[PDB]
Design a protein around this ligand. Structure first.
Ligand SMILES: [Mg+2]
Ligand SMILES: [Mg+2]
Ligand SMILES: [Mg+2]
Ligand SMILES: [Mg+2]
Ligand SMILES: [Mg+2]
Ligand SMILES: [Mg+2]
Ligand SMILES: [Mg+2]
Ligand SMILES: [Mg+2]
Ligand SMILES: [Mg+2]
Ligand SMILES: [Mg+2]
Ligand SMILES: [Mg+2]
Ligand SMILES: [Mg+2]
Ligand SMILES: [Mg+2]
Ligand SMILES: [Mg+2]
Ligand SMILES: [Mg+2]
Ligand SMILES: [Mg+2]
Ligand SMILES: [Mg+2]
Ligand SMILES: [Mg+2]
Ligand SMILES: [Mg+2]
Ligand SMILES: [Mg+2]
Ligand SMILES: [Mg+2]
Ligand SMILES: [Mg+2]
Ligand SMILES: [Mg+2]
Ligand SMILES: [Mg+2]
Ligand SMILES: [Mg+2]
Ligand SMILES: [Mg+2]
Ligand SMILES: [Mg+2]
Ligand SMILES: [Mg+2]
Ligand SMILES: [Mg+2]
Ligand SMILES: [Mg+2]
Ligand SMILES: [Mg+2]
Ligand SMILES: [Mg+2]
Ligand SMILES: [Mg+2]
Ligand SMILES: [Mg+2]
Ligand SMILES: [Mg+2]
Ligand SMILES: [Mg+2]
Ligand SMILES: [Mg+2]
Ligand SMILES: [Mg+2]
Ligand SMILES: [Mg+2]
Ligand SMILES: [Mg+2]
Ligand SMILES: [Mg+2]
Ligand SMILES: [Mg+2]
Ligand SMILES: [Mg+2]
Ligand SMILES: [Mg+2]
Ligand SMILES: [Mg+2]
Ligand SMILES: [Mg+2]
Ligand SMILES: [Mg+2]
Ligand SMILES: [Mg+2]
Ligand SMILES: [Mg+2]
Ligand SMILES: [Mg+2]
Ligand SMILES: [Mg+2]
Ligand SMILES: [Mg+2]
Ligand SMILES: [Mg+2]
Ligand SMILES: [Mg+2]
Ligand SMILES: [Mg+2]
Ligand SMILES: [Mg+2]
Ligand SMILES: [Mg+2]
Ligand SMILES: [Mg+2]
Lengths: 56, 209, 120, 122, 114
RNA sequence: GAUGUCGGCUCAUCACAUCCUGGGGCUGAAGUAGGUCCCAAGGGUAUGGCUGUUCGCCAUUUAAAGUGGUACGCGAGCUGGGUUUAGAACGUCGUGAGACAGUUCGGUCCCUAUCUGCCGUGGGCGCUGGAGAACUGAGGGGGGCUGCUCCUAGUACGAGAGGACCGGAGUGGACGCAUCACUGGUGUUCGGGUUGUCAUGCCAAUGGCACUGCCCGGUAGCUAAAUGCGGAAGAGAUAAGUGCUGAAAGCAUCUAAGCACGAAACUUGCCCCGAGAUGAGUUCUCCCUGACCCUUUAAGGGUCCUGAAGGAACGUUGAAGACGACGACGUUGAUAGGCCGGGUGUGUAAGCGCAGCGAUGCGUUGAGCUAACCGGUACUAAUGAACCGUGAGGCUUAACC
RNA sequence: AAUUCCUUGUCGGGUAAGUUCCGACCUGCACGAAUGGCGUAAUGAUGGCCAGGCUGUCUCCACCCGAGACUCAGUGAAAUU
RNA sequence: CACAGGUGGUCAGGUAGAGAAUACCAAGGCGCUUGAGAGAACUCGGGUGAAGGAACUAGGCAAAAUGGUGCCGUAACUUC
RNA sequence: AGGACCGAACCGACUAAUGUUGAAAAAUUAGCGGAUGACUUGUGGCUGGGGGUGAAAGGCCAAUCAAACCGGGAGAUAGCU
């Protein structure tokens, strides 16, 4: 099956009306090192919930 | 003819001395507290709103909490309504126990059936499968034709096709009340009622009888 | 449907899943901390924790049971000489999953799984 | 659960040895016949000089099934083979005079009381 | 569930004899012909046992009148009046469905002389 | 500058000139059973043998096996037996190539769906301050089938043979909905047996591979053959039809005025969806009671303070689920895993001891192990926050205070 | 009849029921003797018919294991219009 | 095309096996240049299935089933 | 001994499913036939277009065959679109 008529830029745009990405609403600050990080994720330096879980 | 709200505990059996095994569903019917009474003058219809169970005060919201506090009852897990018949008067906060069904013989039990998800036509509509052999090309459990030709030139509404099956309200009617055990808040009905174990159930007296 | 079922297929067959979790259980015992995908880490809990509780009572029978599920005597030895005595008083929950972002090659949700008393 | 083409043993002395169900009598589109249900059969094998001859089309009542019967307490009574008792095509009374092997209490009705009496075990 | 198990518990039979697959047992059941109610005996080898509490069952297989008959009894049903072990068999398997394919000698269970 | 063609399969949908069930008039209608016509489309309306067949015939059913329209419905759904390509043959025709007024054996069926339509499932905004919970019912959909037996009663009817209406009860077929307590199937995540071979140093014990190697059982879940329920009663208005009173037309007349009955059709009654019903409804509860500045002076714009009810997000997840969504829970915690006890399943582990030449047997021992189950238990993971959403809510008129 | 239109000829056998099959009959529309006639053991991925076993072919589908399909990240077509 | 295709010769370990079949290994060589989740319909490739057993269908298509070695035994017909 | 038998390599290609914008302009997977012979295969050679070759299908003659391909006559002709 194929289109009998070419779809318009209007129709193209209206289908991508739901393709918009969503930003992370907020980032959690570690209570010890103060780095911002994803919630429930370790920081970039290995801290999580104040404690340093990963040495490197 | 108001009903109670219960919880499906599970299925079991009951042996009679006459050598018969009755298949039964156990329904836990705790006290149903009346949280609101609707009348014609104010709501246009006579009904009672009931609550059952217990909900953690942490999960109840302030709007829900105030609605309960007006009745002076504790927060249950949900709010359900039952339409009052002529000559049935209840008051807010009155507790209604399973012994209301002490003398009713058949009940209707409404629940939310088990969710089967996206089902095919064979499972959702009992569509006969096509041939499993004999040259059938990739069309074993497919739906077959779905219309005629140019004259309809379309598919009629309500055509039986694949989609969500289950997880919907369904009422089973006229189930014998095997036992009404007020002390343990239990209702034993003969047969299987819709829903999984732990699901909510609305039990009313049978309407056909 | 999938009602009440347990276990994760992980896009493998039964033999591959079982063999892989033997390797990952061995790896976690040897290093006490490894980095896998979050789904794979959540399933390793159900393979390693049974193995540690088994190691709490040391016997020839239990050590041959560990060898069957591990296929490495060095792992069996660490489980019975070191990890069993270490967790002797811990009533389950010998592991800790910490989510650690996303893999660069395929954006897989990764996670570190460690023994709760690994320390140093 | 007897259906069309099912080959049954014969539990009577009518002379037939093996019959084949050619119709499950009862209602329309009816699929199976259990113990106590009348079927139309055809004789596929019969003893010489018997009361019935091979190729004969008559009725029969099913008396034993491998599917078995269920009891009001949930018990089951299943047999090793499916067997029937040959009936007169127009009166639906048995044409044999001796019943062999056990039968079940599902036959305890006004129509098959003769089979109950002749059976060696119910 | 604590509600169902308690419910089923009070319905269970209290004195049910111990038996294992391979045991020859005689089961006395009730046949109720209206007013007349009597006992009928069914004796055969136990080939399967389902242990599910109130829903416990067991399958007894006999050769009656040249025909193999299997009967599944619901252990706690009031129909089953009593069960008695006439002979203890020595089998290694929980389910003896392979006996359905064996005839006469070859269908006999050796006796558990212990 | 291509509208695939017979039959079958799957899935249908409508008409009524009705096959069955329902209602009725007439009968050359005693009863039983029919005949014929009228009303009625709610539901239902065979399996096989033969042949590509549709049909047809036959066999055996059923209350009945309706007739037609739908591109002789349905090949971007299947099939490809027939027909109608290329090979070959027979009969036949032709001098022949070849052909059929025939027959016979063999012979590639593509398409990832843009729009409409349809089945499901979300996101946005709206509904006029915001929010949570419960509803009303405009409308829409589903369902609507029936046999046999017994009682009334061997009564009414009939010379007998035979044999009811009306009414009541029981038990089935088919169809549907739900459910897994039972009977079972499956259960490559549980246990065991065993073949070949490789390895763990060897023995013993185990693991890998050979379709899960091959099998024998089997938990939970799912599920049918399993087992529970349904079709209704009733009400309103009627169809054909039957009347009551009653003139026009001193009679008669069911009709003109008036009145009564009358079917599975119709409107309800039963089940489900359902306020986007923009005609956006109702009830109950909750939340927010700050200060200024400017202009063109408006349902105007900005500044500081403030950020609620609630929501979302994230996390642990679920008999919820393609994804979303929906439900549970997040330390004031049993949401998931683990652990502990039980259950269940398999069937008496390993080690040791004894007996035997040995294979093996016996004891320790219903042992060991045991997934989705049950009951528990904070050991692990569910974080303090942050984020969104504000600050009393237009105008007119009326009543009221 | 690889040939028979009438034709599903008729008769027999086989099936509950056989337009196919087997054995016959002869009324050969339109067989026939090296464009061979008739028969024939063995052979055949050859055509028709029947039976035992066997089974998800089917009554009537259920469940399970995998690969896609679905979601996320990366790359990224096509016919047609 | 870094393409399930095609391409002549030589070499020939162990265990089981008649075997260069086949299964498991050696030496040696590889995991096939997208992954990660989820565990719907439907499609593909498989496993098992109550009772029945060709009723399917143009047709037993497909599937299931049979399957080795030794001894015994083995019909019509025959060109022996 | 044998165009003998069963069966790998090897040579084929009967059936089915898949795939049909393919992994592939003819294959894959499971079955299937021959497998000491009219066998199969390597390297080289010969036959040339109304010609070849053909255990004969109008088969094959470089993915093309009831008359190959390439250049030319050539802007053949086209009452047709
Ligand atoms: Mg998009
Ligand atoms: Mg579900
Ligand atoms: Mg195809
Ligand atoms: Mg297919
Ligand atoms: Mg769970
Ligand atoms: Mg994948
Ligand atoms: Mg394997
Ligand atoms: Mg065109
Ligand atoms: Mg009419
Ligand atoms: Mg009439
Ligand atoms: Mg109708
Ligand atoms: Mg109606
Ligand atoms: Mg029609
Ligand atoms: Mg047509
Ligand atoms: Mg097609
Ligand atoms: Mg079409
Ligand atoms: Mg089309
Ligand atoms: Mg298609
Ligand atoms: Mg054809
Ligand atoms: Mg013609
Ligand atoms: Mg369009
Ligand atoms: Mg069950
Ligand atoms: Mg259960
Ligand atoms: Mg299994
Ligand atoms: Mg099960
Ligand atoms: Mg050894
Ligand atoms: Mg290997
Ligand atoms: Mg009716
Ligand atoms: Mg804010
Ligand atoms: Mg939070
Ligand atoms: Mg031992
Ligand atoms: Mg045990
Ligand atoms: Mg917090
Ligand atoms: Mg001729
Ligand atoms: Mg001559
Ligand atoms: Mg000649
Ligand atoms: Mg010749
Ligand atoms: Mg040949
Ligand atoms: Mg051939
Ligand atoms: Mg032949
Ligand atoms: Mg992508
Ligand atoms: Mg590559
Ligand atoms: Mg290659
Ligand atoms: Mg080669
Ligand atoms: Mg998914
Ligand atoms: Mg799958
Ligand atoms: Mg089966
Ligand atoms: Mg079977
Ligand atoms: Mg047939
Ligand atoms: Mg048919
Ligand atoms: Mg075949
Ligand atoms: Mg040869
Ligand atoms: Mg092949
Ligand atoms: Mg050969
Ligand atoms: Mg030709
Ligand atoms: Mg060529
Ligand atoms: Mg030419
Ligand atoms: Mg010229």
């Amino acid at each position: 099956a194929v289109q009998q008529n070419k779809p318009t830029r209007s129709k193209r745009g209206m289908r991508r009306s739901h393709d918009a990405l969503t930003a992370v609403t907020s980032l959690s600050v570690d209570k010890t090192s103060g780095e911002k990080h994803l919630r429930h994720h370790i920081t970039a330096d290995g801290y999580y919930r104040g404690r340093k879980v990963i040495a490197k | 003819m108001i009903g109670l709200v219960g919880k499906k505990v599970g299925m079991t059996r009951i042996f009679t001395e006459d050598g018969v095994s009755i298949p039964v569903t156990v329904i836990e019917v705790e006290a149903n507290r009346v949280t609101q009474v609707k009348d014609l003058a104010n709501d246009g219809y006579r009904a009672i709103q009931v609550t059952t169970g217990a909900k953690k005060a942490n999960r109840v919201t302030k709007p829900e909490a105030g609605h309960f506090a007006k009745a002076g009852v504790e927060a249950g897990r949900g709010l359900w309504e039952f339409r009052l018949a002529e000559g049935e008067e209840f008051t807010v906060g009155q507790s209604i126990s399973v012994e209301l069904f002490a003398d009713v013989k058949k009940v209707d039990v409404t629940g939310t059936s088990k969710g089967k998800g996206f089902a095919g036509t064979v499972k959702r509509w009992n569509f006969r499968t096509q041939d499993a052999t004999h040259g059938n090309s990739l069309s074993h459990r497919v739906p077959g034709s779905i219309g005629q030709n140019q004259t309809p030139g379309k598919v009629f509404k309500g055509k039986k096709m694949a989609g969500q099956m289950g997880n919907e309200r369904v009422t089973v009617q006229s189930l014998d009340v095997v036992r009404v055990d007020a002390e343990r808040n239990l209702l034993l009905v003969k047969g299987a009622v819709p829903g999984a174990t732990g699901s909510d159930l609305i039990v009313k007296p049978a309407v056909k009888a | 449907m999938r009602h009440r079922k347990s276990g994760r297929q992980l896009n493998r067959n039964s033999s591959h899943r079982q063999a892989m979790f033997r390797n990952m259980a061995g790896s976690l015992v040897r290093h006490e901390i490894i980095k896998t995908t979050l789904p794979k880490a959540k399933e390793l809990r159900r393979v390693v924790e049974p193995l540690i509780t088994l190691a709490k009572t040391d016997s020839v029978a239990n050590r041959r049971l560990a060898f069957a599920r591990t296929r490495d005597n060095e792992i069996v030895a660490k489980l019975f000489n070191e990890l069993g005595p270490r967790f002797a008083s811990r009533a389950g929950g010998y592991t800790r999953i910490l989510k650690c972002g996303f893999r660069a090659g395929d954006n897989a949700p990764m996670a570190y799984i460690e023994l709760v008393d690994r320390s140093e | 659960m007897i259906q069309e083409q099912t080959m049954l043993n014969v539990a009577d002395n009518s002379g037939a040895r093996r019959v084949m169900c050619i119709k499950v009598l009862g209602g329309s589109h009816r699929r199976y016949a259990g113990v106590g249900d009348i079927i139309k059969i055809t004789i596929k094998e019969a003893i010489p000089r018997g009361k019935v001859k091979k190729g004969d089309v008559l009725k029969a009542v099913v008396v034993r099934t491998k599917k078995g019967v269920r009891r009001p307490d949930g018990s089951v009574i299943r047999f090793d083979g499916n067997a029937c008792v040959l009936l007169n095509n127009n009166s639906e009374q048995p044409i044999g005079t001796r019943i062999f092997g056990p039968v079940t209490r599902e036959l305890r009705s006004e129509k098959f009381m003769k089979i109950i009496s002749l059976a060696p075990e119910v | 569930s604590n509600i169902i198990k308690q419910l089923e518990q009070e319905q269970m039979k209290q004195d049910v004899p111990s038996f294992r697959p391979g045991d020859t047992v005689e089961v006395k059941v009730w046949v109720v012909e209206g007013s007349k109610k009597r006992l009928q005996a069914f004796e055969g080898v136990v080939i399967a046992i389902r242990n599910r509490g109130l829903h416990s069952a067991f399958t007894v297989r006999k050769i009656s009148n040249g025909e193999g008959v299997e009967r599944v009894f619901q252990t706690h049903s009031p129909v089953v009046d009593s069960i008695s072990v006439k002979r203890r068999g020595a089998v290694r398997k929980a389910k003896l469905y392979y006996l359905r394919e064996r005839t006469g000698k070859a269908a006999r269970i050796k006796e558990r002389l212990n």
